[PDB]
Amino acid sequence: SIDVKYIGVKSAYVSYDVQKRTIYLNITNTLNITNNNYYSVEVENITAQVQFSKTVIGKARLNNITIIGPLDMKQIDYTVPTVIAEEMSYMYDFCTLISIKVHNIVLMMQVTVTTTYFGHSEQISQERYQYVDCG
């Protein structure tokens, strides 16, 4: 990465900004920009790149082989009882949430057993979180 920027409201290379109830009288502006950008990014010069994988088995007896990849998500229980008994009452529930395992951004790569990789891996995330807003 080169340039990652947080800007909440206003991004401006040049901003002549005037707010409300202003007397903008007798202003003379002269502006010159000579902006030059040169990028030479992510260059590879490989004469020879070799990835080699060999598995050899010879007169071998194999038994009881178990191979499990990542994320073995197994034997899990969720129990959220909600038992409400009522009699002659005044209920006022305005902003109440019951959230179970909510996914917002999930990013997973190359989640494997055997991997041979030559190169680049890049992730960028930019949001603004706001879960609950109740007036």
Count of residues interacting with ligand NAG (CB under 6 A): 10
The C-alpha R_g of the chain, in whole angstroms, comes to 30
Q: Which residues contact 119 (CB under 8 A, 6 or more apart)?
A: none
Tell me how far apart the alpha carbons of residues 122 and 1 are, in angstroms, rounded to a whole number.
Answer: 8
Q: Please, what is the Cα angle at 90 between 87 and 96, to 5 degrees? A: 110
Q: Which residues ranging from 63 to 92 are in contact with ligand NAG (CB under 6 A)?
A: 64, 66
Nearer to ligand NAG, 32 or 104 (CB): 32
Q: Which residues ranging from 93 to 132 are in contact with a copy of itself (CB under 8 A)?
A: 93-132
Binding segment toward ligand NAG, per CB under 6 A, in 24-32, 82-90, 98-106, 121-129: 24-32
Nearer to ligand NAG, 30 or 37 (CB): 30
Tell me how far apart the alpha carbons of residues 81 and 96 are, in angstroms, rounded to a whole number.
Answer: 16
Residues that bind ligand NAG (CB under 6 A): 25-26, 30, 32, 34, 40, 43, 45, 64, 66
